[PDB]
Amino acid sequence: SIVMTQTPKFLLVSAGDRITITCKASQSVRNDVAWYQQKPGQSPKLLIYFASNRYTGVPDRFTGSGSGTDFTFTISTVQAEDLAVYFCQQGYTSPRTFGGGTKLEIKRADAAPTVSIFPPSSEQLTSGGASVVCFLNNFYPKDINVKWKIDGSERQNGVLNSWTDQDSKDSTYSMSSTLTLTKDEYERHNSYTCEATHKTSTSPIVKSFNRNE
Amino acid sequence: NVNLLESGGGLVQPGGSLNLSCAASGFDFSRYWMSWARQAPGKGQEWIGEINPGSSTIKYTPSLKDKFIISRDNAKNTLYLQMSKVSSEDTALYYCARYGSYVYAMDYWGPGTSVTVSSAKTTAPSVYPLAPVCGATTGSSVTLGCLVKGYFPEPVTLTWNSGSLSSGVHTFPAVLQSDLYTLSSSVTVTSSTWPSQSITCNVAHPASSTKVDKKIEPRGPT
Ligand SMILES: *[C@@H]1O[C@H](CO[C@@H]2O[C@@H](C)[C@@H](O)[C@@H](O)[C@@H]2O)[C@@H](O[C@@H]2O[C@H](CO)[C@@H](O[C@@H]3O[C@H](CO)[C@@H](O)[C@H](O)[C@@H]3O)[C@H](O)[C@H]2NC(C)=O)[C@H](O)[C@H]1NC(C)=O
């Protein structure tokens, strides 16, 4: 069974850049290699077939080359909308195996997050559970640290973070930090704070509320 | 108007069986080779198998050749995947795809149908509206939240105002804990539109026949 080793696995590029992805086949696959593009939340689209041919309607940006075991895929001028996973496939013999994919990440300017803190919903506390939600929106780059503070003291247990994929429109990321307490624990304390340390500033972004307000 | 639409995905017991189907339209299905592929969470695409127009040639990736069966009914323009002996390694999004004429390349892919192999039980989400902090917000814009807690399995679909509110939305990926997922979604609108006009989050969890809407209003006695 033929292995398609695709490199690099991850790729950070700016709009305007030429990029070259490589697929190495563990044995000959003639010229019979296709390349696909899979944007977030969408199904793959065929860009290249028989290694060097653009599929119908694919823009001139995208090219491919190779034969035998060495194959490349090239975007001559990377555009923001090219944010996606690119993977190869050999179709010389069954099973028609895929490469592992290359995740393309778009370099844009640094942007601080817009932070919004949310008390437990009016509709949640009756259930006995209490979720405190902090949204950190439209920031770059991806890495960011969220510190929860209850009455001034830090809380690490019960926190869960979730990042969005890079937006195809503005190339930013968003993140939700959810602190899960019991109703009883939530009611013991008054001050609730989420702090967003991002490289865009030395000073953390602080959003806060008091339970009895 | 080439179109593929998968269905049949859902929750199945480990070791159990499940049948997927894929409806083809906008082309003469009987002229084309068809294939199935799948994408496990966080992993790459994996080719499952293919079948030629007359069903005389059916091929599988070896790991699957004794547990999955591919068939097609040209009279119905439908492609089928008979899954059996399933395990957690079979949890994935399953895609049907057409081979282009004269190439073993998948020139059109369906949107996919989600399959989860698990012993855990189907559980509907609680859905909670998240209004801003009690103080009346300054500033030109307002961020609202919708929290979707404690459902199984994936997925859930979340829209705002039945989808007529699409800009300024971020829907965060579900996180799994103790065989229960939690997801949230934020929407940012101008303060001229809220709270003077209504905003609702619409949550659908098909696996539990659940459809819950939550209108979001400012916190406080009513
Ligand atoms: C998944 O689908 C298989 C296959 O059935 C065929 O393919 C599907 C994709 C659809 O197009 C179906 O409409 C189509 O028939 C199902 O297998 C079928 O299961 C039934 C039992 O549920 C079998 O009937 C039995 O047949 C034996 C004879 O061997 C009798 O002794 C029994 O009393 C009973 O009549 C049927 O033969 C079988 N068909 C095939 C081709 O294997 C399967 O049930 C389905 N699975 C799920 C979970 O839906």
Residue numbers in the entry:
A (entry chain B): 25 to 237
B (entry chain A): 15 to 236
Provide the publication's sentences verbatim.
Moreover, PfCyRPA-specific monoclonal antibodies (mAb) inhibit parasite growth both in vitro and in vivo by blocking merozoite invasion.
The parasite inhibitory anti-PfCyRPA c12 mAb binds tightly to PfCyRPA with a Kd of ca. 1 nM as determined by surface plasmon resonance analysis. Because of these favorable properties, we chose c12 for epitope mapping by determining the structure of a PfCyRPA/c12 complex. We obtained three different crystal forms containing a total of four crystallographically independent Fab molecules. The four c12 molecules superimpose onto their variable VHVL di-domains with an average rmsd of 0.35 Å, which reveals a minor spread of the elbow angles between 133.1° and 135.8°. The high structural congruence indicates that the CDR conformations are genuine and not dominated by crystal contacts. Third, consistent with the similar conformations of the CDR loops in the individual c12 Fab structures there are negligible conformational changes in the c12 CDR loops when bound to PfCyRPA.
